[PDB]
Amino acid sequence: KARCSRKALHVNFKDMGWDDWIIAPLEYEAFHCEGLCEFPLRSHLEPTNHAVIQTLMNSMDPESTPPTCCVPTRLSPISILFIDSANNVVYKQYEDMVVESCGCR
Amino acid sequence: KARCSRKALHVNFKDMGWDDWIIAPLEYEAFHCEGLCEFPLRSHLEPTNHAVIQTLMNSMDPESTPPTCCVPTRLSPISILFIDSANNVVYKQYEDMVVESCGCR
Amino acid sequence: QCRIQKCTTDFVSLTSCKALRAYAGCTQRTSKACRGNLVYHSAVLGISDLMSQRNC
Amino acid sequence: QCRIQKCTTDFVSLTSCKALRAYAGCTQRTSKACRGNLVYHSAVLGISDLMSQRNC
């Protein structure tokens, strides 16, 4: 039972059957968030005010409100070179592709 | 076992022992998010690309990656009139206080 | 443009291999105009996984 | 300004009524300069709840 932290999560577009329309890259590290959001919340989690209030109310009465969940708070984009709907090779920057920090919400 | 949705969550500053420094309001509706994030993700959840990929990989292999969590995606601020650290009555707008929409991340 | 979100919302809000074929057809009717969106390919792969899992 | 986050991080990263009194003192040493922050009052209320729960 650890705390909200960032763990590794690799994605392989070729294994997902997307290699027919995606040229490069065929795989990348995307990470994910996992862990308990116990009271109190650390400064590195930089939670929202509502997350703070919900964590406090769940610590007081667990049968009154569920705890906050470990979720990505900051994500970084990655580039993808793919064949579009008109057979045009497009270099597009997809946002929210790699988890760079986790937190409680 | 419902889906990711917004449920009611009331907060009472007077019950939390904050009525000594908070003038008004003493209670407000903050809501919270709760429900499963099953594949596929609806349009109203407006998930991130990483959330989509994680939901897909969890639907394929549940033992490979945990599912996305139901969390607030848009929050609205509320005003608070309180006595500060210098005995000055401050009307401050606290952000991220009321859940207005839920989603999967 | 693409119509993956409408079919996805319909299929999800329905169940809240019966309509899996109907959802696959709803996604296939926009197979050309959605080549590039991650949501469409994710829905297609999930449909394939659900077809291969329920033995149908 | 306020020093609630430092004490909070220390007390959390420690346990990853022993040090609850130490954390309460760390929060009390900045009781004046943190009158208004939701994190400080939340930490104080949680400390009180943990003191009342562990019978100490």
Question: Which residues in chain C are contacts of B59 at CB distance < 8 A?
Answer: 46, 49
Q: Is residue A94 classed as helix, strand or coil in its secondary structure?
A: strand
> How many Cβ atoms sit within 10 Å of the Cβ of residue D54?
10
Quote the minimal CA–CA distance from A1 to chain D in Å. Answer: 9
Chain D meets chain B (3+ C-beta pairs below 8 A): yes
Please state, in angstroms and as integers, the Cα–Cα distance from residue A38 to each residue in A5, A56, A105, B13, B56, following that order: 12, 9, 12, 21, 28
* CB within 8 Å of B42: residues ≥ 6 apart: B3, C5, C8, C9, C12, C13
Q: Is residue A19 classed as helix, strand or coil in its secondary structure?
A: coil
Q: Which of C23, C39, C22, C40 is nearest to C31 (CA)?
A: C40
Whether chain A has a CB inside 8 Å of the CB on D9: the answer is yes
Q: Are the C-beta atoms of residues B10 and A54 closer than 8 Å to each other?
A: no
Give the helix ranges, DSSP H, for chain A.
49-60
CB contact under 8 A, A83 and C33: no
How many domains in chain B? 1
Q: Are the C-beta atoms of residues D5 and D35 closer than 8 Å to each other?
A: no
Q: Which domain holds residue A49?
A: 1-105
CB contact under 8 A, A59 and D46: yes
